[PDB]
Amino acid sequence: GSHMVGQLSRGAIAAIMQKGDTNIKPILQVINIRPITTGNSPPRYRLLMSDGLNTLSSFMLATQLNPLVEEEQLSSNCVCQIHRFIVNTLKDGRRVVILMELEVLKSAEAVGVKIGNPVPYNE
Numbered sequence: 803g804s805h806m807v808g809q810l811s812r813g814a815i816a817a818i819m820q821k822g823d824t825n826i827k828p829i830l831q832v833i834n835i836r837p838i839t840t841g842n843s844p845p846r847y848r849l850l851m852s853d854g855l856n857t858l859s860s861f862m863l864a865t866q867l868n869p870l871v872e873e874e875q876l877s878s879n880c881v882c883q884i885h886r887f888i889v890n891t892l893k894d895g896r897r898v899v900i901l902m903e904l905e906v907l908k909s910a911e912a913v914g915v916k917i918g919n920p921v922p923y924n925e
């Protein structure tokens with residue numbers, strides 16, 4: 803409905819990446835999904851997500867959620883609620899958000915466009 807960015811948890815990306823907040827259950831839009839190079843192991847999916855203010859590509863899906871991508875329930879433009887996630891910090895200082903539980907609130911086909919004009923998060 804009208805004011806589409808009002809459907810997303812504006813400010814959640816900054817909160818996750820800076821405050822270390824893990825209790826929140828933010829609503830985010832998937833902008834893009836791409837497989838990461840793996841080899842002899844299940845694929846892993848990396849996501850460019852939006853909270854309506856920022857985009858951030860430092861999300862990965864827990865492999866238990868792979869069927870959501872492979873059966874096309876989780877795809878570009880869908881709106882999702884993150885019910886459980888963890889944050890990992892790499893040796894170089896970058897942070898990665900591993901999505902453990904999520905719910906698709908609106909399918910990609912029911913949304914159909916990138917919501918708002920989010921700008922890349924500066925980590």
Ligand SMILES: O=C(O)c1cc(-c2ccc(C(=S)NCc3ccc(-c4ccc(C(=O)O)o4)cc3)cc2)n(-c2ccc(Cl)c(Cl)c2)n1
Nearest residue numbers: 838839848859860861862863864865866890896897898900
């Ligand atoms: O090839 C490539 O092109 C490639 C590769 C990677 C990549 C980078 C980091 C890792 C991590 S953070 N290694 C530790 C880890 C992995 C899974 C877990 C876990 C906890 C529960 C589960 C589960 O249930 O599945 O998995 C925990 C620690 C992995 C790949 N990336 C990459 C680079 C930069 C960013 Cl910002 C991102 Cl998001 C990905 N690109």
